[PDB]
């Protein structure tokens, strides 16, 4: 007579959802098979004073219900003032290490404290699970870190040198981006880059962002020199990592072990496949970009690593795909398809998160707009590189994760920090929305805890 | 062939849940007909220094999807060190804020701290007046309660309470009895305002915990005046109007008050094998006393059936039961006689039974069964016509409040993981009392409400019970 919600959870299998809350200041893991919050943690409790918990990634655990670790970072400073919240008040850029122990979440350490390097945007796990990487776009630094020591393996620092020394034309009329090896300054191999240290801009570029800096609405010490770095993502086949740079519309493919950049991929339609990487000294490389056609954002590899994706955003909205089958040489990576839609012609929507099915035949991609247009999810034919369908969901759509058996896509909507928020679930057989679960959180990220190294091919490792 | 969770919600109705988060420092509204959080707020975002969001009560609105308003308080100080979380801030904000918050159909807005308006900060239960024309808050660290005007946030009246133990050692301070003083608390600053914000007036440094009466007796509760505590909890209202009843955990008595004339009228004695009442004696225009010979159990949960004929006060700890008064004589609460106890062979020291909700017809009540970790907590279903336990169901760690859908169809509760482990929203239907399931809830809720539509709704919301 009465409808039981456990009938709903039962289909989804034995999977743990974890998501950070941005302005809520909490991080929260959820049992998708019973509907319980297994545990949550509020950073304010540990003396954090802008706990804007931002991006996160979970390491594989052979049994998440007994134990899992993940990495979650924060933002602070003037990131507080960006959204709808009439705030009346900490630099953020903390890299917290946290273990769920079968019962509670336990803060283990701040790794930006250990390493000396604080970084505010995407967190990713290595394909080996022996490390993680973070990027930040206020400092324009990404680094891989060791799992065991929380020390930096390599860090890279990026600078824009505009052709036109004015914020309106700084990117459009092109210029030169410098790829620089960033080395420690402090005793014991530590950096002096915690919190604010080394910010070029006093807050992260939000969506629609590149215009705000162009038009001068974004203060800081060096905005003419921003490239806004977002993510360092991983080739699921090892060796390579790719740093995405939002403003000049490029990714750089780094060699992981040899600690060198190897290819610079060009994002927009109307550019070749790659630009031309140019060694200056041992620590320094450059790349010429005659004009920037569009700012890009989302990047990621298919889980077999045959395919490599960048989202152009705003000036163009599409998905750029490269042929990445040659594991051997990323200089040989060539454009193979572009994903466009008639519905992508305007300034919005934008496509800033994704997940693949494990068989590499579909992607699911978020579709973002400011209030009030509702946001949603496009389904991508990842073989034919075609839009299959677009379902509208609601306000402020963020990330997408997928249960590892390929069956459900678990997403977050985060209400611009001030309105409706939720977890949406979508089955992947016929892509019907099964519905929404209460998520009183500002999530800009979400994971299902993975069990295996292979699981990470579709977690927060290969894509953001 | 897939189950849609939308079908779960489609049955629930057009109801809107609100719960505060305690150590999560957040408050959220959930739409029970869709799954969505409608909005959430994070107090830290407003320079709140200890955002332990604590008790809440919501005002009726013709359409809560268009607008509702609520009241939410905070705790600060050594309350932070109470739980399993190894908080690291040693010298936290004082809490005792009283937030007025409006949901405008899109978001939550912090209106004002009513405790800054009035000068009177209070940390425990928050309840709405049944004319919905104000609210009340109580507090067991400073043992004061008070009704506020909804429109000015100024105090209508405030009562301080103080204990004078027969035997002046913390072990015997309540068991060997004593005398409680009820004192009219008048404002001492310009603008009709009190000087009682933050930790001001604290007699002990934390609200006593369930089972806590022992911990204070043993000298384990620090503070200025631990011997002079009564641990006031709540000021709940007769839904017929007229009376507010104040609950005192350590003496095991509730004081009935005339809300319009601002005098106490009765003192109801909680424990089995005490009379109905104890003699309320008048000293002067501002001061009453009552002698309690000996205090045989601490009490906690206190409130009224939706029709006002019954008033309940749960003994907790030394006895565990539900004490029930014949409260039908709305003209004269000196005539309120005990008519029944509720017992259970499986009640006690624990479980501790510290929240309740009635059905709108006043036929059943759902009461919380609380234990420390790891004993499963849950809900007991009571027969309120016969005064018997019908059923108990096991749910999970750290059960807290109960609300009910206004058609009377779904009890909706919260479990709060001790601030550190599992937490959820619980749905249970009232026709045959089955547990329909759980909804993620990442908060340490000590309260939750369903936003009422009418004045009649409130009789089964945060107004009559806590
Ligand atoms: Cu982000
Ligand atoms: Cu310059
Ligand atoms: Cu991003
Ligand atoms: Cu190879
Ligand atoms: Cu967004
Ligand atoms: Cu973000
Ligand atoms: Cu996002
Ligand atoms: Cu209903
Ligand atoms: Cu309480
Ligand atoms: Cu004394
Ligand atoms: Cu209470
Ligand atoms: Cu009357
Ligand atoms: Cu509790
Ligand atoms: Cu409670
Ligand atoms: Cu409480």
């Amino acid at each position: 007579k009465y409808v039981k919600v456990q009938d709903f959870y039962d289909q989804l299998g034995k999977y743990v959802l974890v998501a950070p809350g941005k302005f809520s200041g909490t991080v929260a893991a959820t049992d998708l098979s019973t509907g319980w919050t297994m545990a949550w943690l509020a950073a304010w409790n540990y003396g954090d004073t802008c706990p804007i918990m931002h991006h996160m990634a979970a390491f594989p655990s052979p049994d998440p219900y007994k134990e899992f670790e993940f990495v979650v970072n924060t933002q602070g400073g003037k990131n507080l003032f960006i959204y709808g919240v009439p705030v009346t008040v900490g630099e953020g850029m903390k890299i917290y290490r946290i273990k769920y122990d079968g019962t509670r979440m336990n803060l283990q350490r701040d790794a930006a404290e250990v390493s000396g390097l604080g970084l505010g945007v995407h967190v990713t796990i290595t394909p080996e699970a022996d490390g993680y990487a973070v990027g930040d776009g206020q400092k324009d630094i990404c680094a891989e870190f060791d799992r065991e020591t929380d020390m930096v393996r390599y860090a890279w620092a990026f600078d824009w040198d505009p052709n036109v020394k004015d914020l309106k034309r700084a990117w459009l009329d092109g210029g030169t981006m410098t790829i620089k090896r960033l080395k420690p300054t402090l005793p014991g191999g530590r950096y002096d880059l915690q919190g604010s240290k080394g910010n070029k801009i006093d807050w992260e570029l939000v969506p629609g962002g590149e215009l705000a800096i162009e038009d001068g609405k974004v203060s800081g010490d060096r905005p003419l020199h921003s490239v806004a770095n977002d993510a360092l993502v991983f080739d699921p086949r090892g060796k390579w990592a790719v740093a995405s740079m939002r403003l000049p519309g490029v990714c750089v493919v780094f060699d992981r072990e040899n600690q060198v950049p190897v290819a610079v991929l060009a994002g927009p339609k109307g550019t070749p496949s790659q630009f031309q990487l140019v060694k200056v000294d041992d620590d320094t490389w450059t790349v010429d970009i005659p004009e920037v056609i569009s700012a890009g954002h989302q990047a990621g590899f298919s889980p077999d690593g045959q395919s490599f994706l960048f989202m152009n955003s705003l000036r163009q909205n599409n998905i750029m795909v490269w042929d990445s089958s040659n594991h051997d040489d990323p200089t040989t990576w060539e454009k193979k398809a572009v994903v466009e839609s008639p519905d992508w012609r305007g300034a919005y929507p934008n496509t800033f998160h994704m997940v693949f099915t494990p068989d590499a035949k579909k992607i699911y991609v978020t579709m973002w707009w400011p209030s009030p247009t509702p946001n949603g999810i496009a389904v991508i034919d990842a073989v034919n590189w075609e839009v299959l369908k677009e379902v509208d969901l609601g306000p402020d759509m963020h990330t997408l994760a997928i249960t590892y058996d390929g069956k459900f896509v678990v997403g977050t909507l985060s209400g611009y920090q001030n309105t409706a928020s939720a977890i949406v679930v979508m089955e992947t057989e016929t892509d019907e929305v099964l519905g929404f679960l209460p998520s009183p959180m500002g999530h800009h990220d979400n994971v299902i805890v993975p069990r295996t190294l292979e699981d990470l091919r579709i977690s927060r490792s290969t894509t953001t």
Side-chain angles (χ1 to χ4, degrees), chain A residues 1-221 223-464:
Chain A
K1 174 177 183 329
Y2 283 117
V3 166
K4 289 190 54 269
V5 71
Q6 191 57 66
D7 306 339
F8 172 75
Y9 300 123
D10 282 340
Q11 46 182 0
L12 313 172
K14 274 299 184 212
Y15 290 105
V16 185
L17 189 41
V18 196
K22 200 64 196 198
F23 275 63
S24 110
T26 45
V27 51
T30 298
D31 164 13
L32 291 185
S33 87
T34 61
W36 280 80
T37 321
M38 292 141 72
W40 47 265
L41 163 153
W44 87 261
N45 291 351
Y46 303 90
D48 193 354
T49 43
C50 242
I52 314 163
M53 321 289 264
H54 192 203
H55 281 296
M56 81 167 278
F59 295 109
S61 136
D63 195 4
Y65 298 92
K66 299 190 163 178
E67 172 158 333
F68 67 93
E69 312 179 83
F70 59 101
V71 193
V72 50
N73 66 356
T74 75
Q75 263 156 345
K78 299 210 214 82
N79 297 309
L80 211 33
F81 315 98
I82 277 308
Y83 311 82
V85 191
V87 295
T88 41
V89 309
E91 303 191 17
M93 312 281 193
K94 299 209 178 298
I95 296 176
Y96 293 126
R97 302 288 310 267
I98 300 184
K99 191 187 290 194
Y100 180 74
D101 69 352
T103 306
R104 85 200 29 94
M105 277 186 182
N106 312 272
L107 176 83
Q108 319 148 290
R109 79 197 63 91
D110 194 15
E113 269 170 7
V114 191
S115 57
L117 183 55
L119 301 173
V121 188
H122 294 280
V123 178
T124 42
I125 296 311
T126 57
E128 296 72 21
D130 65 9
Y132 53 90
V134 211
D136 184 75
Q138 287 176 68
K139 320 195 177 193
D140 305 328
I141 298 169
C142 54
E144 191 160 321
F145 306 61
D146 183 61
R147 193 181 168 162
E148 305 313 329
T149 67
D150 289 307
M151 300 297 284
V152 177
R153 297 187 165 150
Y154 56 83
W156 290 109
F158 327 91
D159 220 62
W160 188 249
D161 181 356
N163 294 329
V164 183
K165 259 74 188 122
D166 191 82
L167 292 160
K168 279 308 259 86
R169 320 291 324 159
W171 300 276
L172 289 152
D173 296 358
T176 314
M177 189 191 72
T178 287
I179 314 152
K180 186 86 193 163
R181 221 192 276 283
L182 191 89
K183 291 184 237 178
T185 50
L186 299 181
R190 294 176 66 252
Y191 290 76
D192 201 353
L193 292 165
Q194 279 184 239
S196 68
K197 313 212 168 196
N199 286 4
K200 293 160 173 201
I201 55 175
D202 310 311
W203 66 83
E204 197 211 309
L205 295 189
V206 287
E210 82 262 32
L211 307 190
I213 187 169
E214 272 177 353
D215 303 345
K217 289 160 179 136
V218 168
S219 14
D221 300 284
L224 277 162
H225 310 271
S226 292
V227 317
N229 184 248
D230 209 71
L232 180 54
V233 302
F234 291 104
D235 184 340
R237 301 161 309 181
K239 234 199 157 108
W240 310 112
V242 197
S244 61
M245 314 297 170
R246 288 168 60 189
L247 287 168
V250 303
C251 301
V252 189
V253 181
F254 292 94
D255 196 327
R256 290 174 58 207
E257 300 92 286
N258 300 305
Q259 305 196 340
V260 302
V262 301
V264 172
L265 303 176
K269 168 198 202 186
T271 55
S273 256
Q274 304 190 353
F275 287 121
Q276 199 22 66
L277 182 71
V278 168
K279 178 170 185 169
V280 166
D281 65 59
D282 280 54
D283 295 335
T284 334
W285 286 262
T286 75
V287 61
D288 251 38
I289 311 146
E291 67 179 327
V292 179
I293 298 167
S294 185
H297 187 171
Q298 186 47 43
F301 279 88
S302 78
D304 48 37
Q306 303 299 311
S307 274
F308 182 81
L309 278 66
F310 194 48
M311 274 63 143
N312 285 291
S313 296
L314 200 142
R315 301 191 155 121
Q316 299 167 358
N317 304 319
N318 46 49
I319 327 196
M320 187 67 79
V321 198
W322 288 255
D323 188 333
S324 72
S325 58
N326 206 359
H327 185 208
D328 245 61
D329 187 351
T331 49
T332 75
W333 304 356
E334 280 181 294
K335 293 179 168 172
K336 61 163 156 173
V338 204
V339 181
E340 334 204 39
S341 193
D343 321 302
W344 304 353
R345 319 201 115 101
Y348 299 93
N350 311 152
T351 340
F352 65 170
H353 311 295
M354 86 204 201
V355 74
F356 279 79
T357 52
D359 59 20
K361 307 188 199 212
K362 315 162 95 193
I363 345 190
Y364 293 76
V365 297
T366 93
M367 305 271 73
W368 192 89
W369 327 58
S371 202
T373 301
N375 291 196
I377 299 184
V379 186
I380 315 300
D381 187 313
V383 174
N384 282 287
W385 308 100
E386 278 172 28
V387 176
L388 289 186
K389 197 175 148 171
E390 291 165 278
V391 317
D392 286 3
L393 298 160
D396 190 29
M397 179 88 233
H398 284 261
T399 39
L400 303 165
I402 203 181
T403 68
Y404 295 106
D405 65 3
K407 287 204 204 134
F408 307 90
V409 161
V410 171
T412 54
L413 304 105
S414 310
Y416 314 93
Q417 297 313 305
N418 68 62
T419 199
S421 300
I423 303 154
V424 55
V425 186
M426 214 197 233
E427 59 82 22
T428 70
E429 187 180 33
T430 43
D431 317 332
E432 273 260 303
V433 184
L434 317 182
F436 304 82
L437 298 175
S439 227
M441 306 195 70
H443 11 62
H444 279 197
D445 218 322
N446 76 281
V447 293
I448 274 123
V449 185
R451 284 181 177 246
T452 71
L453 305 188
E454 318 95 71
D455 272 355
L456 277 177
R457 293 170 213 160
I458 53 179
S459 193
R460 191 70 59 244
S461 173
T462 52
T463 75
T464 54

